[PDB]
């Protein structure tokens, strides 16, 4: 009635509303495939198997997939049960014979698992480790730009034809990059002490990029730097301020070792103690300008002049 | 509109003028269009289609001769054209080759065998 | 004429559930994007629903009226002490309006207290207060012709709380002489 | 309403595909004079006469230019 | 809920986004015209408005207090007075980003909540991080110069926006520390009622 | 079967075009409403979808063959070679969006150029799987068929050879230039 009637017109209310979602599609088995399905079922004698189904429209599936890629929960499609997103069973379009929709939504649900577990990981940091808490910042910083691309796609939904088969091929170079994160994070979640849980995590990244030696290597490198930031900060602080300022014994010398800084570690310790014996009597902001002026093996071999000349000054 | 006013629009389209200027050519157009209004040959789109295909094959443009076959079906697919023979008979006649004998080939039926 | 109308601007929209003659049929405005009329319609809907759940014992009307810029000149006028159509002497704009109404009440409470030209140093302090209240009237009504509603509440926040501080300084008893000249010190 | 707008789409479609047939046959017509010619051919007119009309007016436009 | 949402995130509630002193901003969850998923996105945005209303209530309440007519700062006094003057200035870009949302929704009539979510997901992090900085001061009755240490132990934050945002507050209240020190080191007199500056 | 066919040729099966791990895409052959001749044309098109599902399964399974890099360069070449088949399918979707009744002979004529290229590259993948072709012998294996004589097949395998020559030149610009090899179990 008068206002709620304006609602019933100017609202898309069909599957999510508690009502059998009736649909005025066009006809003509490009979109009459559900009826064409059912009658040949009944000639082949199922016998009848006429289960209740919600009969969703087409574009709303794309909107739900965009929300699943966002990482939000409590959606009418992909109802998770035990931390595992799972497609519903009454979902059918006028075409795609009720079974193929289950297959394509199963693949997108396999991607929804990868995004949902990372969102749960970030929730368990937000609600002084200095390394995980610095790692989720790089992960989050990836997530915002990814969300920008999908939220842009939602704009051209509301204002050109758009389907499933176009949006999946449009999101190909993003669904490629997310699969790398499903394997990189899997080693950072599978583990109890605070030093091994950070050392193993930081060492896995340095191994996994040397596996990949382009757009994946840029993602892995930009994820590497914002996670190796705390160690570089504490090493520079121990060098120039003459004391090791650690929180929760995060650093490996508890006053079992990352091989990232192993070719120079003797020249670090041999400075820290020699500098501490002197007082009784911006290093990340140098590594990042090095990238402005053969990746992570020879390129990492140019970071060590910055830690070695400062070393030579301290011991001399 | 009516065909008499509509012929003057054609005389203003081909010759770039106003209807107060060009009146000698419109006088000629009324002479040729009038008294030759009724169709003189039996209408069929099939013979005209098989002549446009033959003409496009004759210029070694064998690709457009079967693109015309896909364009001619859409005219039937939409269905707001009543006389499809006349417009194709006209578009074939105003055709120029970008680069002999016709009493031997297939011609339209004369309509004189019937009591018109 | 019809071929002249045929030169129109075409809609290049399409769906899968619309195959035959589908130029466009848009996505019936999803609620959270469609407002400024449908949301205000919607506010009066939930207001009427709560009034039904009460049944005459609530009766919360006036879910209309008026406009934005004249309301800005109205509230900026309230800082001058002025009376208005809604200032005597959705529906959450009453709370937003109280936050800036109680600012103007103390300005009127200052002109009532510091109008006279007993004590001579109290006269000096009273004449020094009007040197400031004219600046308060000068910074207002120079910048905004017609601005947004929230711009007014945000702009007069770093200034209006100081005007409420001046109420606890004065009465709105009060010493006089060396006593007042040392209390203010 | 609706049936007065669906016919507008169905006549834009035909006035485009007739222009495509016009350009592969290399006729000198454009979109505006073709709309006069299809209108004339709707009421029933000899194409052998109207084609001679156009082939005379296009031959007399050159003697004046 | 396009304008009511910017109004409720501005800190002025309304009986869709029902302000509750327990549940902060709370949507009332039973609506026949919207549905449970956008409800979850609205609740996710109402976390930010809940934090903003609690911040503005703490700043209005504890200016340390008003004209100061028992004192301890935020109960009466100066070092936490410097904390709130830092705190509203730190929360200022959230206000100005809301005012920019208002202009964009003025330009286009149909913009999404996912549009608003993507624009305000950078404050969605900074607000729960500074909540614990205020909460330790309230819980441990952190008197005077220990607030300086309390914000500095979290100035080892590792969200770089959070580290910089707390650095601004530390610089501000270091202003009043340097102000008392330029009195006692220079003119020989202390200027402290019930707060201290490490010299009795 | 107008949209289900583009969906099954997209590599997502459905219980008309019954995916069987033995028989690939398989129509179930007993239908009272269609008849045996269009069944044969559908089977002829299902050969292409069978090859595409096997290609995408091989690429998903081995993008990292049994583990490692030279065949990793092979699959990154392989999906990019199969890309015009996807884009021609997306163009079919727009044409069937335009006209409501288009034939299978229409689809057959449009996809009979991939009907050749797919069984030709199947043997290139099959020799690598069968002979356990390790490392740089994949380079020789694709080159002995880069003497193909279908000119689309020759060019399509040339693209793959250029791609995996990329990682050959990448390892060579390490050992010739900085003096160090960079190879785990591949050579």
Give dist(CA C110, CA A276) in Å, integer.
Answer: 65
Nearest CA to A163 out of F11, C15, F87 is that of C15
What stretches of chain A adopt beta strand conformation (E)?
none
Kindly report the number of other CB atoms within 10 A of residue A251's CB atom. 21
Cα-based distances in Å from A195 to A233, A254, B47, C39: 16, 9, 89, 54
Interface test with B, best of D16, D35, D53 (most B CBs within 10 A): D53
Bridge partner residues of E18 (DSSP): E26
CA–CA distance, E26 with E43 (Å, rounded to integer): 7
Number of Cβ within a 10 Å radius of residue A138: 17
Rounded to whole angstroms, the Cα distance separating A147 from E118 reads: 7
- What single string gives the DSSP state of each residue in A18-36? SS--------TTTS-HHHH
Smallest Cα distance from D50 to chain C, Å: 21
- Torsion region of C62: left, alpha or beta (phi above 0 gives left; psi -120 to 50 gives alpha): left
Give the sign of the dihedral formed by CA B3, CA B8, CA B10, CA B11. Answer: positive
Q: What is the dihedral of CA A228, A229, A232, A237, to 10 degrees?
A: -150
Spell C66-82 as b/e; 16+ CB within 10 A means b.
eeeeebbebbbbbbebe
Measured distance CA(F78)–CA(F125) in Å, rounded? 10
Quote the CA–CA distance of E184 and A95 in Å, as a whole number: 83
**CA E152 to CA E133: how far, in whole Å?**
10
| Torsion region of F13: left, alpha or beta (phi above 0 gives left; psi -120 to 50 gives alpha) | beta
Measured between alpha carbons, how far is C63 from C65 in angstroms, rounded to an integer?
7
Is there a contact between A65 and A167 (Cβ–Cβ < 8 Å)? yes
Beta-bridge partners for E20: E24
Question: How far is the C-alpha of E151 from the C-alpha of E169, rounded, in Å?
Answer: 8
Please, what is the angle between helix C93-111 and helix C157-169, to 10°?
A: 40
List subunits contacting chain E, requiring 3 or more Cβ pairs under 8 Å.
Answer: A, C
Nearest-CA distance E4 → chain A (Å): 19
Burial class (CB in 10 A: 0-12, 13-18, 19+), F76: middle
Q: Assess contact for E36 and A74: CB atoms under 8 A.
A: yes
- Quote the CA–CA distance of C108 and C81 in Å, as a whole number: 5
CA atoms within 13 A on the CB side of D50: 30
- Asked if C13 lies within 8 A of A160 by C-beta distance, the reply is yes
Which among C36, C96, C165 is the nearest to E12, CB-wise?
C96
Searching chain E, which residue's CA lies closest to the CA of residue A72? Answer: E41
Residue C39 has which token pair?
């949301």
SS3 E85: helix
Tell me which of C19, C20, C23 to substitute to probe the interface with F (most F C-beta atoms closer than 10 Å).
Answer: C19
Supply B111's token pair. Answer: 């309509």
Distance from CA of C19 to the nearest CA of F (A): 7
**C-alpha–C-alpha distance, residues A74 and A64, integer Å:** 11
- Taking only residues 15 to 54 of chain D, the set having a beta carbon closer than 8 angstroms to any beta carbon of chain C reads 15, 35
Cα end-to-end distance, chain B, whole Å: 28
CA angle at A168 for the pair A166 and A171, rounded to the nearest 5°? 110
Put simply, the answer to whether F100 touches C14 (Cβ < 8 Å) is: no
Angle (CA) E128-E50-A115 rounded to 5° is: 55
Query: Tokens in use for F183?
Result: 């190879």
Chains A & E: contacts with CB separation below 8 Å:
60
Give the 3-state secondary structure of residue E14: strand
Determine the Cα angle at A189 with ends A186 and A195, to 5°: 125
Q: Measure the CA–CA gap between E11 and E8, rounded to whole angstroms.
A: 5
Using CA atoms, how far apart are residues D36 and B6, in angstroms rounded to an integer? 7
DSSP output for A127-184: ---SSHHHHHHHHHHHHHHHHHHHHHHHHHHH-----HHHHHHHSHHHHHHHHHHHHH
Find, among C100, C78, C92, the residue nearest to C151 by Cα.
Answer: C100
Instruction: Copy the structure tokens of residue A273.
Output: 């103690």
Residue in chain E nearest A131 by alpha carbon:
E158
Torsion of Cα atoms, C141 then C144 then C148 then C153, to 10°: -50
Tokens standing for B3? 């065909």
Query: Cβ of F97 and C14 within 8 Å?
Result: yes
Q: Which two tokens stand for residue F98?
A: 């335009």
Rounded CA gap, E198 and B3, in Å? 106
- Cα atoms in the Cβ-side hemisphere of radius 13 Å centred on A65: 23
Can you tell me the distance from the alpha carbon of D5 to that of D18, in angstroms, rounded to the nearest whole number?
Answer: 20
- Percentages of chain D per state (helix, strand, coil), in multiples of 5: 80, 0, 20
Contacts of C12 in chain A (CB under 8 A): 160-161
Q: Please choose, from the candidates A64, A66, A55, the residue with its C-alpha nearest in 3D space to the C-alpha of residue A95.
A: A55
Instruction: Report which of B59, B80, B76 is spatially closest to residue D25, judged by C-alpha positions.
Output: B59
Is A95 within 8 Å of C38 when comparing Cβ atoms? no
Cα dihedral: A22, A28, A32, A36 (round 10): 140
Whether a cis peptide bond, with omega within 30° of 0, leads into F28 is no
Nearest by CB to residue A144, choosing from E110, E121, E160, is E121
Distance between CA atoms of residues E141 and E74, nearest Å: 9
- Cα dihedral sign, C112-C118-C123-C125: negative
Task: Provide the token pair at C170.
Answer: 């004065």
Secondary structure class of F25 (helix, strand, coil): strand
- F168 min Cα distance to partner chain A (Å): 12
N-to-C CA span, chain A = 89
| R_g of chain A computed on alpha carbons | 27
Region for E102 from its dihedrals, namely left if φ exceeds 0, alpha if ψ lies in -120 to 50, beta otherwise: alpha
CB contact under 8 A, B36 and D56: no
Q: Please give the helix or strand (H or E) that residue E105 lies within, else none.
A: helix E79-107
How is residue F187 written in tokens? Answer: 């050579």
Nearest-5° Cα angle at A200, A195 to A203: 120
Lookup: tokens for B56: 């496009």
Please check whether residue B14 touches D, CB under 8 A.
Answer: yes
d(CA C42, CA C40): 5
CA dist., res. B107 & res. C11, Å (int): 44
Backbone breaks in chain F (C–N > 2.5 Å) follow which residues? 63
d(CA C162, CA B81): 80
CA nearest neighbour of B38 among B114, B106, B115, B111: B111
Q: Helix, strand or coil for residue F27? A: strand
Tell me if the bond preceding A97 is cis, omega within 30° of 0.
no
Contact map slice: C 4-43 vs F, CB within 8 A: 14, 19-20
Query: Is C77 in contact with C86 (CB distance < 8 Å)?
Result: no
E18-34 burial by CB neighbour count: b if 16+ within 10 A, else e?
bbeeeebbbbeeeeebb
CA distance C160 to C140: 11
DSSP string, F130-176: HTT--TTHHHHHHHHHTT-SSHHHHHHHHHHHHHHHHHHHHHHHHHT
Q: What determination technique applies here?
A: cryo-EM
**How would you classify the pairing of strands E17-20 and F24-27?**
unpaired
Q: Tally the C-alpha atoms within 13 A of residue C75's C-alpha that lie toward its C-beta.
A: 27
- Sign of the Cα torsion F157, F158, F161, F162 reads negative
What whole-number distance in Å separates Cα of residue F181 and Cα of residue F187?
A: 9
Hey, of F4, F6, F97, which one would you mutate to test binding to chain C, going by the most C CBs within 10 A of its CB? Answer: F97
With contact defined as beta carbons under 8 Å apart, do D47 and D41 qualify? yes
Residue of F nearest to A37 (CA): F16
CB contact under 8 A, D57 and B79: no
A302 secondary structure, DSSP code: G
Euclidean distance between CA atoms C103 and C80, whole angstroms = 10
DSSP tag of F20? E
Closest-CA residue to D61 (of B13, F123, C64, C156): B13
* Calpha distance D47→A26 (Å, rounded): 40
- b vs e for F45-70, b when ≥16 Cβ sit within 10 Å of the residue's Cβ? bbebbbbbbbbeebbeebbebeebbb
Does F97 sit within 8 Å of C20, measured CB to CB?
no
């Amino acid at each position: 009635p008068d206002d709620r009637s304006w609602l019933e017109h100017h609202v898309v209310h069909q599957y999510w509303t508690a009502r059998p979602s009736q649909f005025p599609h066009s006809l003509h088995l490009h979109s009459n495939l559900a009826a064409v399905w059912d009658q040949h079922l009944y000639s082949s004698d199922p016998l009848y198997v006429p289960d209740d189904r919600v009969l969703v429209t087409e574009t709303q599936v794309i909107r739900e997939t965009l929300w699943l890629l966002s990482g939000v929960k409590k959606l009418f499609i992909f109802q998770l049960i035990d931390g595992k997103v799972t497609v519903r069973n009454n979902i059918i379009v006028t075409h795609l014979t009720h079974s193929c929709l289950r297959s394509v939504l199963e693949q997108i649900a396999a991607y929804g698992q990868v995004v949902f577990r990372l969102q749960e990981f970030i929730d368990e940091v937000m609600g002084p480790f200095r390394t995980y808490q610095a790692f989720m910042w790089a992960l989050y910083k990836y997530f915002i730009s990814f969300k920008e691309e999908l939220a842009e796609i939602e704009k051209c939904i509301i204002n050109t034809t758009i389907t499933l088969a176009i949006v999946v091929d449009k999101l190909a170079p993003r669904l490629s990059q997310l699969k790398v994160l499903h394997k990189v994070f899997s080693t950072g979640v599978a583990e109890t002490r605070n030093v091994v849980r950070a050392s193993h995590l930081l060492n896995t990244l340095y191994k996994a990029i040397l596996e990949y030696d382009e757009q994946t290597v840029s993602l892995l490198f930009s994820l590497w730097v914002e996670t190796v930031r705390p160690y570089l900060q504490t090493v520079d602080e121990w060098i120039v301020h003459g004391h090791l300022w650690d929180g929760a014994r995060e650093f490996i010398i508890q006053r079992t070792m990352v091989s990232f800084l192993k070719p120079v570690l003797k020249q670090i310790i041999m400075a820290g103690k020699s500098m501490q014996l002197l007082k009784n009597l911006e290093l990340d902001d140098v590594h990042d300008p090095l990238l402005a002026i053969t990746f992570e093996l020879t390129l990492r071999s140019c970071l060590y002049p910055h830690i070695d000349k400062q070393y030579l000054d301290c011991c001399g | 509109k009516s065909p008499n006013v509509l012929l003057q629009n054609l005389c203003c389209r081909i010759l770039g003028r106003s209807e107060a200027d060009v009146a000698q050519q419109f006088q000629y157009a009324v002479r040729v269009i009038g008294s030759n209004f009724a169709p003189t040959v039996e209408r069929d789109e099939f013979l005209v289609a098989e002549k446009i295909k033959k003409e496009l094959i004759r210029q070694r443009r064998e690709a457009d001769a079967a693109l015309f076959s896909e364009l001619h079906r859409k005219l039937h697919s939409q269905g707001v054209l009543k006389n499809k023979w006349s417009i194709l008979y006209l578009l074939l006649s105003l055709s120029e080759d970008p680069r002999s004998y016709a009493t031997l080939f297939a011609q339209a039926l004369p309509r004189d065998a019937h009591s018109t | 004429l019809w071929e002249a109308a045929l030169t129109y601007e075409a809609s290049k929209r399409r769906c899968w559930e619309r195959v035959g003659c589908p130029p466009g049929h848009r996505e019936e405005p999803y609620l959270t994007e469609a407002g400024r009329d449908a949301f205000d319609k919607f506010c009066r809907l939930h207001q009427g629903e709560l009034q039904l759940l009460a049944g005459g014992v609530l009766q919360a009307p006036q879910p209309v009226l008026v406009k934005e810029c004249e309301l800005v000149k109205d509230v900026l006028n309230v800082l001058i002490g002025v009376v208005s159509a809604t200032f005597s002497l959705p529906e959450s704009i009453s709370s937003l309006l109280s936050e800036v109404a109680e600012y103007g009440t103390c300005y009127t409470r200052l002109s009532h207290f510091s109008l006279q030209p007993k004590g001579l140093v109290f006269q000096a302090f009273t004449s020094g207060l009007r040197r400031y209240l004219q600046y308060y009237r000068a910074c207002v009504l120079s910048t905004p012709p017609t601005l947004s509603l929230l711009t007014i509440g945000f702009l007069f926040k770093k200034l209006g709380r100081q005007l409420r501080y001046l109420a606890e300084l004065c009465g709105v008893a009060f010493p006089t002489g060396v006593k007042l000249l040392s209390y203010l010190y | 309403a609706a049936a007065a707008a669906a016919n507008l789409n169905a006549v834009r479609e035909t006035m485009d595909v007739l222009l495509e047939i016009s350009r592969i046959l290399n006729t000198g017509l454009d979109m505006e004079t073709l709309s006069i010619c299809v209108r004339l051919c709707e009421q029933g007119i000899n194409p052998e006469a109207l084609s001679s009309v156009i082939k005379e007016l296009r031959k007399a436009t050159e003697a004046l230019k | 809920m396009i304008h009511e949402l910017l109004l409720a995130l501005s800190g002025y509630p309304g009986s869709i986004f029902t302000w509750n002193k327990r549940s902060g901003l709370q949507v009332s969850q039973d609506f026949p015209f919207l549905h449970p998923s956008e409800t979850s996105v609205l609740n996710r945005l109402c976390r930010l408005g809940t934090d903003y209303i609690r911040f503005t209530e703490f700043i209005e309440q504890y200016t340390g207090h008003v004209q100061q007519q028992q004192g301890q700062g935020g109960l009466h006094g100066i070092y936490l007075r410097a904390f709130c003057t830092g705190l509203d200035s730190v929360l200022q870009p959230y206000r100005q980003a809301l005012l920019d949302l208002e202009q964009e929704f003025l330009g286009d009539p149909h913009l999404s909540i996912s549009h608003v979510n993507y624009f305000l997901d950078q404050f969605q992090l900074l607000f729960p991080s500074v909540m614990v900085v205020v909460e330790q001061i309230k819980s441990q009755k952190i008197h005077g110069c220990q607030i300086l240490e309390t914000v500095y132990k979290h100035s080892c934050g590792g969200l770089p926006p959070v580290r910089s945002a707390l650095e601004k507050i530390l610089a501000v209240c270091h202003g009043v520390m340097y102000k008392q020190l330029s009195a006692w080191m220079l003119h020989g007199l202390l200027l402290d009622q019930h707060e201290e500056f490490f010299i009795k």
